[PDB]
């Protein structure tokens, strides 16, 4: 009386739309997982290249003497005359 | 040939995955580089001393006679 057979299909179409909907959803969700991944890798490069950063800073200070030594003592071997 | 216009979502999907692989390679390479850059913080200090030894052998060599 209030609808009967009408409210019968007003659902058939609903179940469809929800089916179209969750469908699109899965695509998007799928894209979002690949993106988390691309994201995770990008974030690791920046923490990695930032580590090897300190290994290029110290490896600096230490060569900021290494040759500076074979320099301070470079001349000291001039007594090849004396 | 022309742009692309039939499944722009999947397109990005795919377009995103290629980038993922280009990055599996970069993460990998940054690893071979993290190791190499280890043998350097060693031999560095391992030569930062190899010199701090050729020095005293001159300050003392000099100061002495020869």
């Amino acid at each position: 009386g209030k609808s009967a057979s009408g409210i019968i299909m007003e659902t058939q179409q609903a179940k469809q739309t929800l089916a179209d909907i969750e469908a699109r959803h899965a695509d998007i969700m799928k894209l979002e997982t690949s993106i988390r991944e691309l994201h995770d890798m990008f974030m690791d490069m920046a923490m990695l290249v930032e580590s090897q950063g300190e290994m290029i800073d110290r490896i600096e200070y230490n060569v900021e003497a290494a040759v500076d030594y074979i320099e301070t003592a470079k001349v000291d071997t001039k007594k090849a005359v004396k | 040939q022309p742009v692309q216009q039939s499944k722009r979502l999947q397109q990005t999907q795919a377009q995103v995955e290629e980038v993922v692989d280009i990055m599996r390679v970069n993460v990998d390479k940054v690893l071979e580089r993290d190791s190499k850059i280890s043998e350097l913080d060693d031999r560095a200090d391992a030569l930062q001393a190899g010199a701090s030894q050729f020095e005293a052998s001159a300050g003392k060599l000099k100061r002495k006679f020869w």
């Binding site: 995770d40 890798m41 690791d44 990695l48 580590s51 | 599996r24 993460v27 990998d28 690893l31 993290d34 190791s35 280890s38 913080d41 060693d42 200090d45 391992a46 001393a49």
Partner: peptide, 28 residues
């Protein structure tokens, strides 16, 4: 050896980070 200690003791944790990362993505 005093130096070769910190040298191998460091490389360790470096390997702890290498694998952890290398596996996280599936390498070899």
């Amino acid at each position: 050896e005093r130096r070769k200690e910190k040298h191998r003791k460091m490389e360790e944790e470096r390997e702890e980070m290498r694998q952890t990362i290398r596996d996280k993505y599936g390498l070899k």
